[PDB]
């Protein structure tokens, strides 16, 4: 036996936390410093750019909080990349860069800032900040939201951040936690970052497995042999993907029709049904004990 800690008194004194806290999704201590606007602004949105890394997806959204819940003003998913050229490799650093770039260019041509603030067209790898142009509508500002991801040097959240900055979103940041940062000498090489953006870290390991052994290469990159993805095709493929994002980042929905409207879920049992169930269980127990 044990001394039962979880008693009726324990459940009476027990206070639950918030719903997203119990699910394990929201850092409220982080969001209380992120999302609240100063009160001398009185109505303005405070735009945050949320990056969430999934095992098979990358979600990059731009939102602002209201009292009835926040409203997404723009969204971008990493599974929109087969519409642009990236057939496979939807969850790596280059896909995060393309998702952030698509988010930025979609927000710019939905607000009307397509021609003004072109961003970094020719990708270099250095530091970049979007400066406000006088006589023009100002540059969009938003603040990054990494959520519950440990932000070390070389994160896909920061890759999507660099993609949004190269798309033209005026986000305050630093080159300290971009990949390529030297930890013991504290300078930014700005060429290793270009290799990570263009995807040479994956292609060099493809070449390494190709010279090591064919079976482990196939096991690691089975859908890179599928659709004919060679390591020499990789940089030109991401160049064509970036060009496709810059020439057409607008989004189209789909005509959701022809739904049979059936119920895959089990409906809820009612009061008379539960009372009849427990009455039948009592009667069945009495009928079982009136036998011997």
């Amino acid at each position: 036996f044990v001394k039962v800690v979880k008693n009726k008194a324990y459940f009476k004194r027990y206070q639950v936390k918030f719903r997203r806290r119990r699910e394990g999704k929201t850092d409220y201590y982080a969001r209380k410093r992120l999302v609240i606007q100063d009160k001398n602004k009185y109505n303005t949105p405070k735009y945050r750019m949320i990056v969430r890394v999934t095992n098979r997806d990358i979600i990059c959204q731009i939102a602002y909080a209201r009292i009835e819940g926040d409203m997404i003003v723009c969204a971008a998913y990493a599974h929109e990349l087969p519409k642009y050229g990236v057939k496979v490799g939807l969850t790596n650093y280059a896909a995060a860069y393309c998702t952030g770039l698509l988010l930025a260019r979609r927000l710019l041509n939905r607000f009307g800032m397509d021609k003004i603030y072109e961003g970094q067209v020719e990708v270099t790898g250095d530091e970049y900040n979007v400066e406000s142009i006088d006589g023009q509508p100002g540059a969009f500002t938003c603040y990054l939201d990494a959520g519950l991801a440990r932000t070390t040097t070389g994160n896909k959240v920061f890759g999507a951040l660099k993609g949004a900055v190269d798309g033209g979103l005026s986000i305050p940041h630093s080159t300290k936690r971009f990949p390529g940062y030297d930890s013991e000498s504290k300078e930014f090489n700005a060429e290793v970052h270009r290799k990570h953006i263009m995807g040479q870290n994956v292609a060099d390991y493809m070449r390494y497995l190709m010279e090591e052994d064919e079976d482990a290469y196939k096991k690691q990159f089975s859908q890179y042999i599928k659709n004919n993805v060679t390591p020499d095709m990789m940089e030109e493929m991401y160049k064509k993907a970036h060009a496709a994002i810059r020439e057409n980042p607008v989004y189209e929905k789909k005509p959701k029709r022809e739904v049979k409207k059936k119920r895959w879920n089990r409906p809820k049992m009612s009061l008379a049904q539960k009372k009849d169930r427990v009455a039948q269980k009592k009667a069945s127990f009495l009928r079982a004990q009136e036998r011997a």
């Binding site: 269980k281 009592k282 127990f285 009495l286 004990q289």
Partner: protein
């Protein structure tokens, strides 16, 4: 020895118990609060004779001890050594204070002197359960125990079954319906809200 109970009779001050703040309290005179054949079931002592006060006052622990000894002695001489069960339903916790002289009133706060029990109007002082053939002896025992307390008390043979909260006319009906389980000195109530495994452990 101590000051007479004319001075410590009425509920004059706030209830002042022994706690972390009030330390150094002398121990109460009454130690055992219930005796007789207390190792007994509810099915054999259906008497439920109560001493009920009629004044909002304070009763001392030494008076509780004296009335317990008097009721115990008369019930042993009347019905037997193990034919009754006496509870004293007043546990004294109010610490009374003493201001003894050799200054005078200069910085006059009391040291703890003893314990006393706040008694409401309509509150049970003592309770005796035994058989139904014992009513006059229980009434005379409580009458002899009234003479150790100040104020005015009453003796009432209640409608309950011994030391339970249930009425005696419906007690045997609830036991026959197995809504009540005889559990030691008291009784256990079964609502229709538990799990069905408890119902299956019963009724078989």
């Amino acid at each position: 020895g101590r000051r007479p109970a004319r001075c410590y009779r009425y509920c004059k001050n706030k209830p002042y118990p022994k706690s972390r703040f009030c330390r150094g309290v002398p121990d109460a005179k009454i130690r055992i609060f219930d005796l007789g054949r207390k190792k007994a079931k509810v099915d054999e002592f259906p008497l439920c004779g109560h001493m009920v006060s009629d004044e909002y006052e304070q009763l001392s622990s030494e008076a509780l001890e004296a009335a317990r000894i008097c009721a115990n002695k008369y019930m042993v001489k009347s019905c037997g050594k193990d034919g009754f069960h006496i509870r004293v339903r007043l546990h004294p916790f109010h610490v009374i204070r003493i201001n003894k002289m050799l200054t005078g009133m200069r910085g006059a706060f009391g040291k703890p002197q003893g314990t006393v029990a706040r008694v409401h109007i309509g509150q049970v002082i003592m309770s005796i359960r035994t058989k139904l053939q014992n009513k006059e002896h229980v009434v005379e025992a409580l009458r002899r125990a009234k003479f150790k307390f100040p104020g005015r008390q009453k003796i009432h043979i209640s409608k309950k079954w011994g030391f339970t909260k249930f009425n005696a006319d419906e007690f045997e009906d609830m036991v026959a319906e197995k809504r009540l389980i005889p559990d030691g000195c008291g009784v256990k109530y079964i609502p229709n809200r538990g799990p069905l495994d408890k119902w299956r452990a019963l009724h078989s």
